[model samples]
Target: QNTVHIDLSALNPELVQAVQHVVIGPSSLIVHFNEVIGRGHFGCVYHGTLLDNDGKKIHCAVKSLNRITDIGEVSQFLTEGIIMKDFSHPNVLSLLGICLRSEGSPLVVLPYMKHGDLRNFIRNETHNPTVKDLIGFGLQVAKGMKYLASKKFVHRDLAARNCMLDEKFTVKVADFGLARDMYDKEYYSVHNKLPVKWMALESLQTQKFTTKSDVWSFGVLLWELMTRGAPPYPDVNTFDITVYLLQGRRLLQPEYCPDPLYEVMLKCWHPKAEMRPSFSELVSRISAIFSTFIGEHHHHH
Candidate 1:
């Protein structure tokens, strides 16, 4: 057998072993963690080279979680890996494999996004993206989230920052760094470290997130596109922004942001969660808006 086996220590006597289906196997010796390109709540991501068995150089982004000091941390982190294995969509980021041979925390291999996160792309003055460009990105993201919704998964965190752009500028929703996908929502609850600015009123109050809540965040994401990645509710603090939304104040229309697009955002932030439009609905709405821009611009971002 030409099979290369995983080590006993890797098959660790630990209570929770690393996920095999998602483990990186042709041997990590061929993988190189070159440099840190981005940081997440759990760890730093490095831009690396994956030299395959055929001598092909597959460029990748590797997310290295903080050192795995205990068994509990292992299981908790595997939730994200488990989630990654279930995803298959061009607009969504997928896990290539997991590198457990590393000395510190495990390494998650993903396709490299040359343009990086959408926020930075929009924020950069050099690109000077047109309205059509922003709408195109938004439409791509809506398509991704719609696919996620069809699978009954909640992103929990959906923002421009969580969306990555490939070399072709196609957007892929990412950063399941700490269980990005919540397939089970009935018992999902959290008390801290929420992205308050992008959250819905009901979610902010009850700490329960559903597809509708993701719609709310998508609305804010639309606002981010409109504002060129300006911080949401700039004049208000996180705690105060919750109160501000409670008082029924949504973000004002960004300068030059068309009326219909802002209307779409308003529908997402409705007081009642049930009133929010589904991701499918948003896709059509943004599509129409994008169509209008397309009719006029006759170009790409």
Candidate 2:
């Protein structure tokens, strides 16, 4: 059995209080870990269950840290929890609480999403989705992103894999590993590694990310949805993506992608960050497409 370390006094006071109310003891978590559901660079996610405030069992997804020997990693992990605590939108993933263990890294508790991440969900579908389905899903994502834009949060890693779906197939933007508030600026820069294929041109060039960069990623996500989860820039090598992008190349229109939708995707790939459409505009445009698709479906029926 792992010893428990309950220490939050040094963290943000507000966050500590918020976490305290919902924090589950390490022993309670050990009993509920059902199975390993997913894994990533940060850690492994386990399917689990726990009792809520009223004493009823509820399902949850627990993300346990993989490594945490340094202060920087701990800061980022705690920052993710703090950031998640402030989000209250339906399209955004909700954090239930956190678990502090003596042997392993901290754990983040979230609502269990049975359908899993959007990329794998799309790829494993039994049949192709109609245009309406595609547009509908895209609109759901855009609405979530629009909400994030309003909050001035930049999701530096906004990709298909970073989003999750519930049993109802509703998409909730998940995985806040690289997300942060814009902090009164239009852009933020980092020197670490990032997802190059999903990055905006300016982001790739200068390591700077803004809301526009997320918009650029949304375009790639649209491509993934349309192409049934094919990796972006399939022909280009990872290390060469920057060079290819710098040379004015972008992912071509997927064979099944509609012209209007492809047009919007192209706008998102604009070489200059300022030239990209804002998430608000993207929501409006996609909503317009949804209306058009619904009308077309009704007419054919």
Candidate closest to the true structure, highest TM-score: 2
TM-score of each: 0.87, 0.90
Once model 2 is optimally superposed onto the true structure by TM-score, how far is the C-alpha of residue 110 displaced, in angstroms? 0.2
TM-score of candidate 1 versus the correct structure, residues matched by position: 0.87
Residue-level lDDT of model 2, residues 243-301, one tens digit each, is 89888888888887789999999999998878889888988999888777642221110
Clashing pairs in 2: none
* Poorest lDDT segment (10 consecutive residues) of candidate 2: 292-301
Task: Tell me the TM-score of model 2.
Answer: 0.90
Inter-residue clash pairs, candidate 1: none
Position 19, candidate 2: lDDT = 62
